[PDB]
Structure formats: structure tokens, C-alpha cells
Write a protein that holds these residues in place. Structure first.
Motif, PDB file in Angstrom:
ATOM      1  N   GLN A  14      51.241  10.118 -22.454  1.00 53.14           N
ATOM      2  CA  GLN A  14      50.564  10.520 -23.694  1.00 53.14           C
ATOM      3  C   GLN A  14      50.361   9.370 -24.681  1.00 53.14           C
ATOM      4  N   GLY A  15      51.043   8.256 -24.427  1.00 51.46           N
ATOM      5  CA  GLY A  15      50.880   7.056 -25.212  1.00 51.46           C
ATOM      6  C   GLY A  15      52.038   6.759 -26.136  1.00 51.46           C
ATOM      7  N   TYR A  16      52.187   5.487 -26.471  1.00 54.06           N
ATOM      8  CA  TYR A  16      53.196   5.036 -27.413  1.00 54.06           C
ATOM      9  C   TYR A  16      52.517   4.732 -28.735  1.00 54.06           C
ATOM     10  N   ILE A  31      49.906   6.136 -34.979  1.00 53.80           N
ATOM     11  CA  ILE A  31      48.786   5.423 -34.388  1.00 53.80           C
ATOM     12  C   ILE A  31      49.159   4.880 -33.013  1.00 53.80           C
ATOM     13  N   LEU A  32      48.428   5.330 -31.994  1.00 47.28           N
ATOM     14  CA  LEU A  32      48.539   4.808 -30.638  1.00 47.28           C
ATOM     15  C   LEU A  32      48.348   3.291 -30.555  1.00 47.28           C
ATOM     16  N   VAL A  33      49.298   2.620 -29.916  1.00 46.53           N
ATOM     17  CA  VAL A  33      49.213   1.186 -29.681  1.00 46.53           C
ATOM     18  C   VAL A  33      48.419   0.947 -28.387  1.00 46.53           C
ATOM     19  N   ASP A  34      47.228   0.361 -28.518  1.00 48.30           N
ATOM     20  CA  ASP A  34      46.337   0.158 -27.379  1.00 48.30           C
ATOM     21  C   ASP A  34      45.888  -1.297 -27.226  1.00 48.30           C
ATOM     22  N   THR A  35      46.483  -1.987 -26.257  1.00 47.16           N
ATOM     23  CA  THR A  35      46.083  -3.354 -25.949  1.00 47.16           C
ATOM     24  C   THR A  35      44.769  -3.427 -25.160  1.00 47.16           C
ATOM     25  N   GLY A  36      44.212  -2.279 -24.773  1.00 44.88           N
ATOM     26  CA  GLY A  36      42.985  -2.245 -23.967  1.00 44.88           C
ATOM     27  C   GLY A  36      41.661  -2.082 -24.712  1.00 44.88           C
ATOM     28  N   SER A  37      41.721  -2.051 -26.043  1.00 47.06           N
ATOM     29  CA  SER A  37      40.525  -1.914 -26.881  1.00 47.06           C
ATOM     30  C   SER A  37      40.715  -2.661 -28.197  1.00 47.06           C
ATOM     31  N   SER A  38      39.701  -2.617 -29.062  1.00 41.79           N
ATOM     32  CA  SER A  38      39.661  -3.473 -30.246  1.00 41.79           C
ATOM     33  C   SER A  38      39.237  -2.769 -31.535  1.00 41.79           C
ATOM     34  N   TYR A  70      30.150   4.369 -32.314  1.00 43.25           N
ATOM     35  CA  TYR A  70      30.401   5.189 -31.134  1.00 43.25           C
ATOM     36  C   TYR A  70      31.240   4.375 -30.157  1.00 43.25           C
ATOM     37  N   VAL A  71      32.371   4.946 -29.739  1.00 41.56           N
ATOM     38  CA  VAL A  71      33.257   4.279 -28.792  1.00 41.56           C
ATOM     39  C   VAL A  71      33.543   5.180 -27.585  1.00 41.56           C
ATOM     40  N   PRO A  72      32.908   4.871 -26.440  1.00 39.98           N
ATOM     41  CA  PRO A  72      33.260   5.450 -25.154  1.00 39.98           C
ATOM     42  C   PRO A  72      34.283   4.572 -24.403  1.00 39.98           C
ATOM     43  N   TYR A  73      35.399   5.166 -23.991  1.00 41.95           N
ATOM     44  CA  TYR A  73      36.386   4.474 -23.159  1.00 41.95           C
ATOM     45  C   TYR A  73      36.164   4.890 -21.707  1.00 41.95           C
ATOM     46  N   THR A  74      36.955   4.343 -20.785  1.00 44.30           N
ATOM     47  CA  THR A  74      36.909   4.816 -19.392  1.00 44.30           C
ATOM     48  C   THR A  74      37.169   6.317 -19.380  1.00 44.30           C
ATOM     49  N   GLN A  75      38.107   6.731 -20.223  1.00 44.18           N
ATOM     50  CA  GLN A  75      38.451   8.121 -20.419  1.00 44.18           C
ATOM     51  C   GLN A  75      38.337   8.461 -21.899  1.00 44.18           C
ATOM     52  N   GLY A  76      37.514   9.457 -22.215  1.00 42.70           N
ATOM     53  CA  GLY A  76      37.406   9.948 -23.580  1.00 42.70           C
ATOM     54  C   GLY A  76      36.438   9.145 -24.423  1.00 42.70           C
ATOM     55  N   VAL A 229      45.742  -6.102 -19.082  1.00 42.86           N
ATOM     56  CA  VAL A 229      46.978  -5.453 -19.526  1.00 42.86           C
ATOM     57  C   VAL A 229      46.601  -4.455 -20.618  1.00 42.86           C
ATOM     58  N   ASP A 230      46.917  -3.180 -20.386  1.00 45.67           N
ATOM     59  CA  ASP A 230      46.327  -2.078 -21.149  1.00 45.67           C
ATOM     60  C   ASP A 230      47.350  -0.971 -21.438  1.00 45.67           C
ATOM     61  N   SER A 231      47.920  -0.977 -22.645  1.00 46.93           N
ATOM     62  CA  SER A 231      48.942  -0.007 -23.034  1.00 46.93           C
ATOM     63  C   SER A 231      48.367   1.380 -23.327  1.00 46.93           C
ATOM     64  N   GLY A 232      47.049   1.462 -23.484  1.00 46.84           N
ATOM     65  CA  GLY A 232      46.379   2.736 -23.745  1.00 46.84           C
ATOM     66  C   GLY A 232      45.918   3.476 -22.496  1.00 46.84           C
ATOM     67  N   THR A 233      46.428   3.059 -21.336  1.00 47.79           N
ATOM     68  CA  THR A 233      46.195   3.728 -20.042  1.00 47.79           C
ATOM     69  C   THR A 233      47.545   3.970 -19.361  1.00 47.79           C
ATOM     70  N   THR A 234      47.759   5.169 -18.817  1.00 44.59           N
ATOM     71  CA  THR A 234      49.050   5.506 -18.191  1.00 44.59           C
ATOM     72  C   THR A 234      49.341   4.692 -16.924  1.00 44.59           C
ATOM     73  N   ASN A 235      48.418   4.737 -15.966  1.00 44.88           N
ATOM     74  CA  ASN A 235      48.683   4.267 -14.615  1.00 44.88           C
ATOM     75  C   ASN A 235      48.412   2.788 -14.374  1.00 44.88           C
ATOM     76  N   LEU A 236      48.966   2.287 -13.273  1.00 39.41           N
ATOM     77  CA  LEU A 236      48.430   1.101 -12.625  1.00 39.41           C
ATOM     78  C   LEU A 236      47.134   1.531 -11.962  1.00 39.41           C
ATOM     79  N   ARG A 237      46.059   0.823 -12.266  1.00 40.57           N
ATOM     80  CA  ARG A 237      44.763   1.153 -11.680  1.00 40.57           C
ATOM     81  C   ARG A 237      44.281  -0.035 -10.877  1.00 40.57           C
ATOM     82  N   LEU A 238      43.759   0.223  -9.682  1.00 42.36           N
ATOM     83  CA  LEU A 238      43.422  -0.864  -8.770  1.00 42.36           C
ATOM     84  C   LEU A 238      42.021  -0.694  -8.190  1.00 42.36           C
TER      85      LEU A 238
HETATM   86  C1  LIG Z   1      47.866   6.153 -23.540  1.00 39.55           C
HETATM   87  C2  LIG Z   1      47.811   6.889 -22.206  1.00 39.55           C
HETATM   88  C3  LIG Z   1      47.216   8.278 -22.410  1.00 39.55           C
HETATM   89  C4  LIG Z   1      46.735   8.919 -21.107  1.00 39.55           C
HETATM   90  N1  LIG Z   1      45.321   8.659 -20.843  1.00 39.55           N
HETATM   91  C5  LIG Z   1      44.371   9.485 -21.609  1.00 39.55           C
HETATM   92  C6  LIG Z   1      44.228  10.918 -21.069  1.00 39.55           C
HETATM   93  C7  LIG Z   1      43.687  10.958 -19.638  1.00 39.55           C
HETATM   94  C8  LIG Z   1      43.692  12.389 -19.097  1.00 39.55           C
HETATM   95  C9  LIG Z   1      45.030   7.936 -19.744  1.00 39.55           C
HETATM   96  O1  LIG Z   1      45.866   7.470 -18.983  1.00 39.55           O
HETATM   97  N2  LIG Z   1      43.918   7.188 -19.748  1.00 39.55           N
HETATM   98  C10 LIG Z   1      43.427   6.456 -20.774  1.00 39.55           C
HETATM   99  C11 LIG Z   1      42.316   5.752 -20.341  1.00 39.55           C
HETATM  100  C12 LIG Z   1      41.522   4.896 -21.266  1.00 39.55           C
HETATM  101  O2  LIG Z   1      40.333   4.704 -21.077  1.00 39.55           O
HETATM  102  N3  LIG Z   1      42.179   4.391 -22.329  1.00 39.55           N
HETATM  103  C13 LIG Z   1      41.621   3.591 -23.419  1.00 39.55           C
HETATM  104  C14 LIG Z   1      42.299   4.095 -24.715  1.00 39.55           C
HETATM  105  C15 LIG Z   1      42.553   5.590 -24.799  1.00 39.55           C
HETATM  106  C16 LIG Z   1      43.803   6.056 -25.217  1.00 39.55           C
HETATM  107  C17 LIG Z   1      44.057   7.423 -25.299  1.00 39.55           C
HETATM  108  C18 LIG Z   1      43.053   8.337 -24.958  1.00 39.55           C
HETATM  109  C19 LIG Z   1      41.801   7.891 -24.535  1.00 39.55           C
HETATM  110  C20 LIG Z   1      41.557   6.510 -24.459  1.00 39.55           C
HETATM  111  C21 LIG Z   1      41.681   2.072 -23.192  1.00 39.55           C
HETATM  112  O3  LIG Z   1      41.352   1.430 -24.424  1.00 39.55           O
HETATM  113  C22 LIG Z   1      40.710   1.582 -22.109  1.00 39.55           C
HETATM  114  N4  LIG Z   1      40.749   0.093 -21.997  1.00 39.55           N
HETATM  115  C23 LIG Z   1      39.554  -0.470 -21.273  1.00 39.55           C
HETATM  116  C24 LIG Z   1      38.258  -0.111 -21.959  1.00 39.55           C
HETATM  117  C25 LIG Z   1      37.236   0.525 -21.258  1.00 39.55           C
HETATM  118  C26 LIG Z   1      36.046   0.856 -21.915  1.00 39.55           C
HETATM  119  C27 LIG Z   1      35.888   0.562 -23.270  1.00 39.55           C
HETATM  120  C28 LIG Z   1      36.916  -0.069 -23.974  1.00 39.55           C
HETATM  121  O4  LIG Z   1      36.801  -0.375 -25.268  1.00 39.55           O
HETATM  122  C29 LIG Z   1      36.061   0.533 -26.110  1.00 39.55           C
HETATM  123  C30 LIG Z   1      38.090  -0.408 -23.313  1.00 39.55           C
HETATM  124  C31 LIG Z   1      42.130   6.071 -18.997  1.00 39.55           C
HETATM  125  C32 LIG Z   1      41.193   5.690 -18.035  1.00 39.55           C
HETATM  126  C33 LIG Z   1      41.282   6.202 -16.739  1.00 39.55           C
HETATM  127  C34 LIG Z   1      42.307   7.085 -16.398  1.00 39.55           C
HETATM  128  C35 LIG Z   1      43.255   7.472 -17.351  1.00 39.55           C
HETATM  129  C36 LIG Z   1      43.151   6.958 -18.647  1.00 39.55           C
END
Ligand SMILES: CCCCN(CCCC)C(=O)n1cc(C(=O)N[C@@H](Cc2ccccc2)[C@H](O)CNCc2cccc(OC)c2)c2ccccc21
Ligand SMILES: CCCCN(CCCC)C(=O)n1cc(C(=O)N[C@@H](Cc2ccccc2)[C@H](O)CNCc2cccc(OC)c2)c2ccccc21
Lengths: 387, 387
Positions: A14-16, A31-38, A70-76, A229-238
């Protein structure tokens, strides 16, 4: 840095998060600490999953930048309205900064129910900030406006078992040390790998082993198309090809017990009678990282206690249950929270390098420990990066 | 103990030997060091494979005990005539012992062509001496007649590649330190296991792992009907059931390459193009040994560099060839020379214990080393010893 020790709460699924205040008078927010975004962004409107949010009309120091984002992440994803305001970190350095804030007005699958956070602190570089790199990230603002050294370090502490809602609220989830390194947070030596480029915290993986057995792929495949290195993602992704090889190998090493394909897909639980999880049948995974010194590398080794993520047994039994916390990626390698939980990670922005040390709070058993070891000087290297 | 360092020659396949002199004037002979038996015996009559032998009639100090002796080992046997004589070790302690000596007059599959030894030094206890326990073994005589401490230690040094006749004669094979411990022969800590009973150097194994994976057998099976440290045997030998489980697990771990049945039987070599031996596909093997402290244990870990024994090709080539140096036993576990090659072994008779530390001369690669590690406390070890 005792004042900042134990300032984090949460868990990998769920995040730190860290406590912050925004506005005048101060509005407290987690506030979620996320090293994977800016982007630094906060809930700014009522939402089912938020118990509080940023109320701009209530802050005398709020400044409207009159611009959407507008900010689209890999998830959400989310959209919001840009502005600036005064921000502090109660259990960080004694400073107040005027920083960019995206006030989130709409979102899809971003906020997480029960996570106890209301916003996100994107700690990576301007290059990946939205709408563009002119929107100065929070950490850059902090360094420019104050005397804080240009670095931070993270100790994410996984429990090794499920934590309920009240347990997560009551426990320490780790430490974010802003402006330094705390020696109580690790054991042994800190090894550094260069940040390849200042956008994500991008690094280069030169070799992968499963129980000492070389995956034996062209090293470029490990960094296709990047490794972060991405604290805002749960898993090791490969990357697809790496993932298939790793999974096949992990299945082979642990072949004395058979598991559903759903488990290896990271969606289905496996459960064992209380206490009987057969850690020993699951292999360790070593990732070799490019060293600071030419022709040199080091390795980080993680246990199944890192890549098997503890989850609740909701049934009427005392079973210990886990999800497989390795997933397939189409956007390169992601060293997410379950990996970071093994290590004290130093984001040395000043010297453009990332340090790894065995964490003082990593989960293990009496037979194996996570490790950070080097140097290795015989590795085929140099062109492991992707272009 | 500089004078005693590098006093051994030989190899695991043919044995490690020390120079001794017997009789007056001194007759120089090469003598196999054997922790697995208790009779001191020398060739005393011409044999096809002996370049020299003990000539009693030329020794003024020879005493004839007018009694025959027959010694059958697991492999090989000899018959001889008992007597005593003065014995020295030129590169040992500066002492002269009057010791029992079996003069070998008949033998069957004992002496080894090209081995360069002409007798055997049984270093274990009287209980297993022939014809019976009243025939005082050499080390006992040494301790009784001198001020030499009741301790010896062995560093057997495997080359990691095959040694022709010329090379084995010119190469140092390790060290036997009589009366003490040389700190330059090992790294890290010395860990001690109790000698269960003073006959063989008997020990107790509590757990076996292949690449960290528990063999999962009742510990009695590891010590059925005994477990001994034995320099006069090449291979690690394992009870039938343990051997079958170990081989199955070693096969599984290394399954990316397939090997003939005759390889796993220890009978036939496998060869790889020069330098390409895939060490990484073969697992490590850990043996956990009973600690001195109650309910505490430690582990010794060996590499395939120990359990794959380097041999010369049948059709001479530049290939790197090996035999599988693990065999099935009907007489308990034997920790043979290929195991001992990983470690500096301290036979601390005075304190009824055996010490293990990583050998400064063990063969390894850049990615893995042999290890001696502990303590471990979660292990159930009650009836591990066999009665
Ligand atoms: C904290 C762990 C929570 C669990 N969680 C969410 C729920 C999933 C059901 C989860 O594990 N995932 C979180 C993912 C993810 O995309 N996280 C971004 C931040 C974030 C934190 C919390 C919620 C949403 C997003 C991160 O910034 C991406 N970095 C690269 C990047 C990519 C593109 C644009 C960009 O910049 C704009 C940066 C994610 C991806 C894949 C699988 C699982 C994933
Ligand atoms: C350096 C080894 C060279 C290779 N070699 C010989 C050639 C094999 C074809 C080999 O590996 N083996 C050597 C074995 C062996 O029995 N060795 C004894 C000494 C010795 C040294 C040199 C030659 C012969 C003998 C030792 O004393 C037994 N200890 C328990 C014990 C048992 C019974 C009585 C007893 O006491 C009265 C003590 C052996 C056994 C099984 C497989 C391979 C074996």
C-alpha cells in the motif's frame, strides 16, 4: 539524524508515507514516498478513500498557478490544478519550503483504501515531472531554498507478516533520512552504483543469479528499456524475457512443491500451516549492479522473505499466506518496495550515485540473510545499458 | 609453526603424504596421512609400485615383536609383521619416537602406482587398531614420549586441476601441523564439533542442505551407522538413503545440463572445453555439525570445486575433466579428502573436538567460496547419533 529515524509508516502493498504539513495555518497530510516519479500532489477534494484533503481556500499562503496537470503512471492516474504553498516535514529537517503542489481534483485507481495517505511525494528528477521539466520537483526546491545536503536515504521496513489496519497505524514502517545517512539503519558496507541518467533513479544491472546460477542472458536484456529504483511500486518488475527466465528458474529451484500458475502470476495466494513456510526450497536472487570503479561490480542478494509478500489469511485458520511479488514489465526493470525492504538505500544526488547496504530491519531466518557484496572484476560489462 | 608448513605432497585421488624416517641409520620413507585408521605400517618387501621399502635387518634399533598383523580397510588390505623402531618426522617436531610399526610383507590393492608413498600413518585411536587396542598408535606414543601437545591439524590443498607425475612431486600438497594450529592456513573463525567417541574421529551431522534446500531427513540417517573425518579416502561417502536424496537434489539443481548415469556413479569423467566448466549450475553442499554448546550447531559449506575431482582426460586434450567425488556408503558417512580440501581441520584430541575453518588454499571462483558459519539454534538435534 535521530529526529528523522522511524518517521515512516506503511507496508509494501500500500506504500510507505511520511507526515507533512501544507499551507497556512498548517494542514497535516500523510504523503506517499515515491522515488519513481517527480510530482508532489495531494488530494484536494473529498474522495471515498480519503479521510482528509488539502483545502486551498483555507491557506493564506496558497498561490494559484492557473494551470492544469495530468499524471498517468504505469498504474493509476490523476489530474489536478497547479499551485505553490509553504510545506514542512514535522519529522524531517526543521525547515519550511515554498514548493509546487498539484491539487488533485479527479483520479482513477490512484488512492488506496486504508493506506492512510492522501498525497504523493515524487522524489525523482525534473525530466519526468508533468506537465514538463520546468515544474521544479519538491526535493530540488528543498535543496535550493535551505541548507539541506542534496541527498536522502530510505529504510523501508517490511514486517515479514500481515499487519492489520490498527497495527499498520501503530508500527514504525521505516525511515526517510533527509540530507544524510544514519549508520544505525544498516550493517556492513554501503556499495554505490552510478545513476546512469537523472530522470528516474536509473541504474544498470550487469548480471542476475538464481541460487548462484547465472541467468546467462545478454546483460542489455536486464536493462530493457531501463532499470529504476521505485518505492512507489510494490513488486520487483522485470522485462518479459528476464521475467520468463527468472520464473522458470525459480519454479525449477523450488520444484519439490508445486504451485498454481496464478501464484506465479502474482495474483493468487499460497498458504502454509502456521510457521511451516518452506523458505529453504525457494532460491535467493542476486542482482549485480555496475560499480563506481571501472570494470567493477557488486551484488545485492534478496531472500524469498523479500519476494514472497505476506498477506492476510481471511479464512478460519492460522495459515501463513503470501503473494509472489515479482511481476512482468513492458517498461524495463523496476526495483520496487519488496526489494528496497532488504536494504538501506542512499539516494546520493550530489555524487550521482545510489548506495545499498543490508538493512537493519530486513526479514530473514537463521539460515540465510540478505547481502550486499563486492567487488566482482571478471564480468562482461560496459554495454549493459540500453539506447 | 613455519618448519611444519607445506610439509605434505599428493592429491585427493592418491592421498596426501608426509616424509618420515624409520630405524638407525634413518631410512627415509613417504607415509600417507590417514585419519581413518590407527595402524602405522610401511612396505617392508619389494612391490611393483614401491621405489623403496623398510629394511629391518639394516636397522640397529629394530625390535621384532614376533607377531603377525592383518588389516582390511573398506578398500584394500595388507598383512605384515609387528615390531618397534625409532621414528622421526624431518619436517615435523624435532623429536624421536619409539613406535609400533607393521612391516608389510603382503598386500592387495593398497599401494597406488605413482602415488610416491610407501606406508600409512593411522592417526585415529587405539580402539580401531589391529590386531587390537593394546597396540599403541603412533600419535599416542608421540604424545607420551615427548612434550608435543595432544593436537594436530591438517590443511590438504587440492590444486583444482590435474597434476601429472612431475607436477605432483614438485607441488606442495598442504600441511600437517603436529602439536598446534598455524593461523596462516585458514581465514575467519575456527568452529568446533565434539568427537562423539574416540575410535574413528567420529562426529555428528545434524542437517544437510543442497543450495540452501534442506534434504529434510531425520538426522539419524546422516549418521547411520557413524560419521567420520577420513583423509585416507578420496570421496565424500554417504549412507545409501542420504546419497540417493543428495544425488537427486544435485541432479535437479544442475538440470540445465544432462550427465550420463556413470558420472553420478562416480565411475566416468565429464569434460568441458578448456576453462568453460559451468561451476554456477552446480549447487553448494552444507553439512551442519553439532556444536560444543548445547542445542547449537554450525555449518561447513563446499563448492562443486570440491566435490568435482579434477582428472586427466582419457584421450589427452586441453579439456577440463572431472569425476563426481560423492559415493554411496554402507558403513556411514565418510568426510573424505575432497571435503577436507575445503577446510583447515584441527584434530584437538586434548579437548575431544574437531575444528573446521575455511582453508586458505581451497579452490573457488569469483562468485562463491567455501564457508564455515554459525551458530544455529532452531535445529532439533536429539537422537542424531546412532546406537
Ligand atoms: C506504493 C505501492 C502501492 C501499490 N501499487 C498501486 C496499486 C496497484 C494495484 C502498485 O504496486 N503499483 C504502483 C505502480 C506505479 O505505477 N506507481 C507509481 C506511483 C504510484 C503510487 C501509488 C499508486 C499509484 C501510483 C510510480 O511513480 C511509477 N514509476 C514509474 C513511472 C511510470 C510512468 C510515469 C511516471 O511518472 C509520472 C513514473 C504500479 C505499476 C505496475 C504494477 C503495480 C504498481
Ligand atoms: C587416499 C585414498 C586414495 C584412493 N582410495 C584407494 C583406492 C580406491 C580404489 C580410496 O579413495 N579409498 C580408500 C578407502 C579406504 O578404506 N581407506 C582407508 C585407508 C587406505 C588408504 C589408501 C589405500 C587404501 C586404504 C581408511 O583407513 C578407511 N577408514 C575407515 C576404515 C574402514 C575399515 C577398517 C579401518 O581400519 C582398519 C578403517 C576407500 C573406501 C571406499 C572407497 C574408496 C576408498
Amino acid at each position: 539524524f535521530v529526529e528523522m529515524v522511524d518517521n515512516l509508516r506503511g507496508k509494501s502493498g500500500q506504500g510507505y508515507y511520511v507526515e507533512m504539513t501544507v499551507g497556512s495555518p498548517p494542514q497535516t497530510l500523510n504523503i506517499l514516498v515515491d522515488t519513481g516519479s517527480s510530482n508532489f500532489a495531494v488530494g484536494a477534494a473529498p474522495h471515498p478513500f480519503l479521510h482528509r484533503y488539502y483545502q486551498r481556500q483555507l491557506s493564506s499562503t496558497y498561490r494559484d498557478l492557473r494551470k492544469g496537470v495530468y499524471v498517468p503512471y504505469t498504474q493509476g492516474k490523476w489530474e489536478g490544478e497547479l499551485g505553490t504553498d509553504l510545506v514542512s516535514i514535522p519529522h524531517g529537517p526543521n525547515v519550511t519550503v515554498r514548493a509546487n503542489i498539484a491539487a488533485i481534483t479527479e483520479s482513477d485507481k490512484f488512492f488506496i483504501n486504508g493506506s492512510n495517505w492522501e498525497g504523493i511525494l515524487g522524489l525523482a528528477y525534473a525530466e519526468i515531472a508533468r506537465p514538463d521539466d520546468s515544474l521544479e520537483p519538491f526535493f530540488d526546491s528543498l535543496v535550493k531554498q535551505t541548507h539541506v545536503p542534496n541527498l536522502f536515504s530510505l529504510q523501508l521496513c517490511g514486517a515479514g507478516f500481515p499487519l492489520n489496519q490498527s497495527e499498520v497505524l501503530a508500527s514504525v514502517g521505516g525511515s526517510m533520512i533527509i540530507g544524510g545517512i544514519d549508520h544505525s539503519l544498516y550493517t556492513g558496507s554501503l556499495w554505490y552504483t552510478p545513476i546512469r541518467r537523472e530522470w528516474y533513479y536509473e541504474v544498470i544491472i550487469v548480471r542476475v543469479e538464481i541460487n548462484g546460477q547465472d541467468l546467462k542472458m545478454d546483460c542489455k536484456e536486464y536493462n530493457y528499456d531501463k532499470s529504476i529504483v521505485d518505492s512507489g511500486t510494490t513488486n520487483l518488475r522485470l522485462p518479459k524475457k528476464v521475467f520468463e527466465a527468472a520464473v522458470k528458474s525459480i519454479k525449477a529451484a523450488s520444484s519439490t512443491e508445486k504451485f498454481p500458475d496464478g501464484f506465479w502470476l502474482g495474483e493468487q495466494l499460497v498458504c502454509w500451516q502456521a510457521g511451516t513456510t518452506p523458505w529453504n526450497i525457494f532460491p535467493v536472487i542476486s542482482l549485480y549492479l555496475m560499480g563506481e570503479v571501472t570494470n567493477q561490480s557488486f551484488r545485492i542478494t534478496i531472500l524469498p522473505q523479500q519476494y514472497l509478500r505476506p498477506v492476510e489469511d481471511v479464512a478460519t485458520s492460522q495459515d501463513d499466506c503470501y503473494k509472489f511479488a515479482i511481476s512482468q514489465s513492458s517498461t524495463g526493470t523496476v526495483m520496487g518496495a519488496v526489494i528496497m525492504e532488504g536494504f538501506y538505500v542512499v539516494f546520493d544526488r550530489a555524487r550521482k550515485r545510489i548506495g545499498f547496504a543490508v538493512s537493519a530491519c530486513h526479514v530473514h531466518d537463521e539460515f540465510r540473510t540478505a547481502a550486499v557484496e563486492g567487488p566482482f572484476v571478471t564480468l562482461d560489462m560496459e554495454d549493459c545499458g540500453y539506447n
